[PDB]
Structures are given as C-alpha cells and as structure tokens.
Write a protein that binds this ligand. Structure first.
Ligand SMILES: NS(=O)(=O)c1cc(C(=O)NCCO)c(S(=O)(=O)c2ccccc2)cc1Cl
Ligand SMILES: [Zn+2]
Length: 257
C-alpha cells in the first residue's frame, strides 16, 4: 500500500510503520559545518573485485540490482564499521527534475539522485536476521549530479526497458559496481534507518562526499520506468525519495577535514 503519492507517500507512512517517527530515522540533512571531524575514523574498505550480480527487479518503488551474498565476495568494512558487511543489492532514488531526487541533502542541497549499496553484517548470518539488529546494515550512499555520463552506469540504464512495470525482473549478471564509485571515499557517517518501509532502525549510514556525475539521458531513462504494474494506468516512477527527517539526538561524523 505504501508509496510516494499524496495519499500514500512519506507523510502517511507512520500509520502502518510507527517507527517512522522514531529516534534514528533516515535520511537527514548533512550540515557540513556542524559535522564532527573524527581522526579515529578508518578509511572505508570497499572490496568489490569478485561481486556477482544476479538480477534486476522493478518492485514498484525503485529497481534493485541483486547480488549473490552467499559468500564473502563483495564486502564493505573499515570506515566506522566493526567487522564485515556483505553487499546484497543496490538501488537508486531520483526526481521528476534534475533539481531534486536525493534522500540525504548537503547543506539543504538536493542532488538529482542517490545510489544506495545495501550491505549486511555477516555476524548475523543473513539479511533477514541483520535488519532486526541495531548494527545489522551498512548502506553506502552516493549522490548523482547531472553532467558528464557515467560509463559504468550504462549497462544498468540499457536494461530498464525490459523491467518497465512493477513486478518485472530480468537476469543481470557480470555487473561491476566499482564502475559506480567516485574517486574519493571521504564520507560522513551517522546511525539511522531504512528510508523505505519498514523503516527499521538498523543502518550505519556512510554517505560519500564526492558525487558521481551522470548524463541527462541516463537519468531521463530512469524516469521512463513505471510504479504501476503492466496493464494498469501509467504512473511514471519519479520522486521516489523520502525527505530529510529530524536528526534528534545524533551527531554526524566526518572522515575528512
Ligand atoms: N533506501 S535504503 O535505506 O537504502 C533500503 C531500501 C530497501 C528497499 O529495497 N526498498 C524498496 C525500494 O527502494 C531495503 S530492503 O530491505 O531490501 C526492501 C525491499 C523492498 C521493499 C522494502 C524494503 C533496504 C534498505 Cl537499507
Ligand atoms: Zn534507498
């Protein structure tokens, strides 16, 4: 039932998912001036050499690229984390226009889109168990701006025609997520939540400072997807982002400056 419209969008979610109004909700505005530099923070370790993508699915909220997470093949560690998190999926949030679409903001600035690489803590054995724990997930968030194309994104953009509507899925193998990363791994980090129902408070957020640029034609192709299922009235999949939530009793830490 939940989604992103006037009658079922973010402002409604708390009815079905009361944690919506909880103490560590995501996303947030990152006020770069009040973020605390922490010189005890380690470089982030992104080991994506042997990642195995399996598929791509339109779930009627976004598209998820799924990975085989049955072995330590694509892992995040270091940075603020204790131990090892395995990549399960990535997806994006984006706008109807280039001036909005990101979930986190930087000094109130909205980017065209935001990439989420979702990982789970191996101490909990799998994803379903991890989401029930306060340190279960680490999500690496990367901002997209419109400018030069990202060559490494094009394989994703080119398959979207095949998964236009809610419930459609395609085989999607040999996709290399390293091609979606910016040069720098400087980051902000804070404890928060899933940004979509069920909104569970289980995420260590790691948000990269450096955006990637993607072309207008690449993001235009994301906007051709549909929230509706095949043979329902067409509703373009745009503005699938939750706005900034109250920081409450949290400090955002920076790995830089
Ligand atoms: N946005 S996010 O905080 O990185 C985030 C987004 C989703 C998500 O896929 N949501 C559905 C569409 O985005 C998930 S999920 O647990 O795989 C899930 C899938 C489908 C429906 C609900 C939930 C986990 C995280 Cl951590
Ligand atoms: Zn997300």
């Amino acid at each position: 039932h939940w989604g992103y419209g006037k009658h079922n969008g973010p402002e409604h979610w708390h009815k079905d998912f009361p944690i919506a109004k909880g103490e560590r909700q995501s996303p947030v505005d990152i006020d770069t001036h009040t973020a605390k530099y922490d010189p005890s923070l380690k470089p982030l370790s992104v080991s994506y050499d042997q990642a195995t993508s399996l598929r791509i699915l339109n779930n009627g909220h976004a598209f998820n690229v799924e990975f085989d997470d049955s072995q330590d093949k694509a892992v995040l560690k270091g940075g603020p984390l204790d131990g090892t998190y395995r990549l399960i999926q990535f997806h994006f949030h984006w706008g109807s226009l280039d001036g909005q679409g990101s979930e986190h903001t930087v000094d109130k600035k909205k980017y065209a889109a935001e990439l989420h690489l979702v990982h789970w803590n191996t101490k909990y054995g799998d994803f379903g168990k991890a989401v029930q724990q306060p340190d279960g997930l680490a999500v690496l968030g990367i901002f997209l701006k419109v400018g030069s194309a990202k060559p490494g994104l094009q394989k994703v953009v080119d398959v979207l025609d095949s998964i236009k509507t809610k419930g459609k899925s395609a085989d999607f193998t040999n996709f290399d997520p390293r091609g979606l990363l910016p040069e720098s791994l400087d980051y902000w980090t804070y404890p928060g939540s899933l940004t979509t129902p069920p909104l569970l408070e289980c995420v260590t957020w790691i948000v990269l400072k450096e955006p990637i640029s993607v072309s207008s034609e690449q993001v235009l192709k994301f906007r051709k997807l549909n929230f509706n299922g095949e043979g329902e009235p067409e509703e373009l999949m745009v503005d699938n982002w939750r706005p900034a939530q109250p920081l409450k009793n949290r400090q955002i830490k920076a790995s830089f400056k």
